[PDB]
């Protein structure tokens, strides 16, 4: 749940060797009292919150894609042009030379420029009272009243864990020469 | 009381956040010795010329007018290869534009003699794109940021063209270290 | 009355303990004629250069960037004189030192502490007492590294060996 004072909020510190700063308000989901370098005192909290959410969701999709492409599951006909191997780096370069990742870049950049930049600008300027990471996307309808947390908190924690997992997996693939699993 | 851009220096007087792009950045005290109106007009002019100049330094490599005299991908070669009477016409037309657009008040003693004359406000809005009141400050901020970025980019592009003897995009595609 | 460090010398009158690291050590009387703000700015600048220099001798001989040839740091000065990286470093240090000139003028007007460049992006000094403690640590490391860099360079000039190889044998 939202668990204010147990999982989030003021007074929670998961790493007590660095004391929780006075700058953290406790309103932001994922506030577990970890800012040793005191960035919250001077940065804009909405911007860095949205940046954490975007990095996290990108890393979640990245982990799912990396694992499904390194185990061997592929779409029909996708092995032929992109190579019958399992190495993610060569998959990136092969899909670049095919043009697939150019199309992915074009459409992700079109979405990011068309609505992402205005959403970030209107959230920061104070014209919509939009929350960080809130793109109003619930087609299947899974958070209505449980939205406070057990959806937000699990999203940010899985985002951060996916960030660490993707970073680890990439550098392990570099040093070992073999994809995960 | 301290400058926001440079936190170990005191805030410069006559900089009070009113102008667009004001972050309190004047360590050398130019605004304490010279008027801010002339400095802003000069900054906007240098920035606008550099916006056009950076856009030219990238575009003229990709797109040319027909003819041998307009076929130089490198801009410093296009300065010499372009017809001389045309470039002298460009100089004379820029002079006439500077003369009429400032309404015969061109100098450090007579430009801004009219109290209604605003720094960088030559009255230029051909399509009237400035017809929005809350848009104005953000527009001036975007214009001055584009101008500052263009100044840094064009300065770098000219001197890198001098170093590499290559047009900018094809220098980025055919890069050779010093 | 007398100096805290040198008990048989009198305390210099302009060394009243306002600057952290003051133990009343000035037998030549530099603070009796010269401005102490300028002297403290010079002390901290010389010391910070020396701290970066000693760390550079340790790391830059432990590791070397792949896009550069391998050589000793003293020979690296002479190499980068001709290669052109040293001109770049001198130019950028000079560029920062122009605003250092402005900062020194602000110090002489009393609007800036003689070492305060307001550079704490990681927020390491939270409260006052931490700032005094880190000031004393910085001043001590500055003086220590000022001695140690001269040690490193002169001992390389005599033995033609770097610090870490000189530690292994004699």
């Amino acid at each position: 749940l939202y668990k204010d004072g147990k999982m989030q909020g003021k007074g929670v510190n998961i790493i007590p060797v660095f004391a929780r700063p006075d700058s953290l308000d406790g309103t932001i989901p994922g506030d577990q009292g970890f800012d040793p370098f005191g960035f919250s005192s001077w940065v804009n909290m909405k911007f860095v919150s949205e940046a954490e959410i975007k990095h996290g969701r990108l890393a979640m999709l990245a982990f799912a894609g990396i694992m499904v492409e390194s185990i061997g599951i592929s779409f029909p006909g996708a092995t032929s042009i992109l190579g019958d191997s399992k190495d993610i780096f060569e998959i990136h370069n092969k899909a670049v030379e095919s043009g697939a990742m150019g199309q992915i870049l074009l459409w992700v950049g079109f979405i990011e420029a068309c609505v992402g930049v205005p959403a970030m600008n209107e959230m920061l300027s104070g014209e919509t009272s939009r929350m960080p990471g809130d793109f109003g996307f619930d087609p299947l309808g899974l958070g209505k009243g449980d939205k406070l947390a057990r959806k937000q908190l699990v999203e940010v924690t899985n985002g951060r864990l996916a960030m660490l997992a993707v970073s680890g997996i990439v550098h392990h693939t570099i040093i070992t020469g073999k994809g995960p699993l | 009381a301290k400058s926001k851009a440079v936190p170990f220096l005191s805030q410069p007087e006559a900089l009070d956040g009113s102008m667009a792009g004001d972050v309190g950045f004047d360590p050398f005290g130019f605004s304490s010795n010279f008027d801010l109106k002339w400095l802003r007009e000069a900054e906007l002019k240098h920035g606008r010329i550099c916006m056009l100049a950076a856009t030219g330094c990238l575009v003229q490599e990709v797109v040319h007018l027909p003819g041998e005299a307009f076929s130089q991908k490198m801009a410093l070669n296009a300065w010499a290869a372009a017809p001389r009477g045309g470039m002298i016409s460009i100089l004379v037309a820029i002079g006439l534009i500077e003369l009429i657009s400032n309404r015969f008040a061109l100098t450090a003693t007579d430009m801004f003699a009219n109290p209604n004359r605003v720094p960088g406000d030559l009255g230029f809005d051909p399509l009237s794109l400035g017809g929005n009141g809350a848009n104005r400050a953000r527009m001036e901020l975007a214009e001055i940021t584009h101008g500052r970025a263009a100044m840094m980019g064009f300065s770098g592009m000219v001197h890198q063209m001098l170093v590499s003897k290559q047009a900018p995009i094809e220098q980025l595609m055919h890069f050779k270290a010093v | 009355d007398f100096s805290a460090a040198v008990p048989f010398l009198k305390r210099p009158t302009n060394l009243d303990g306002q600057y952290i690291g003051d133990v009343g050590f000035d037998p030549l009387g530099f603070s009796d004629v010269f401005d102490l703000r300028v002297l403290r700015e010079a002390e901290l600048k010389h010391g910070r250069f020396a701290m970066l220099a000693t760390l550079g001798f340790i790391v830059q001989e432990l590791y070397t960037f792949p896009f550069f040839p391998k050589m000793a740091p003293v020979d690296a000065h002479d190499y980068f004189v001709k290669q052109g990286g040293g001109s770049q470093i001198i130019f950028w240090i000079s560029f920062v030192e122009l605003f250092g000139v402005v900062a020194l003028f602000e110090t002489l007007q009393g609007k800036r502490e003689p070492g305060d460049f307001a550079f704490d992006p990681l927020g390491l000094a939270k409260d006052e007492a931490t700032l005094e403690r880190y000031r004393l640590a910085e001043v001590k490391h500055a003086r220590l590294a000022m001695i140690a860099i001269g040690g490193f360079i002169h001992q390389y000039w005599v033995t033609k060996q770097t610090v870490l190889e000189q530690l292994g044998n004699f």
Binding site: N93, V96 | E170, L172, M173, F175, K176, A177 | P66, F67
Partner: peptide, 25 residues
């Protein structure tokens, strides 16, 4: 010139390729 941003083998040595070769030496 009909080449890519990175990982080009031929007469196309981009700035990204220069960065990569500088790192891998």
């Amino acid at each position: 010139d009909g080449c890519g941003a990175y990982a080009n083998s031929g007469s196309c040595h981009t700035f990204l390729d220069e960065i990569g070769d500088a790192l891998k030496a």
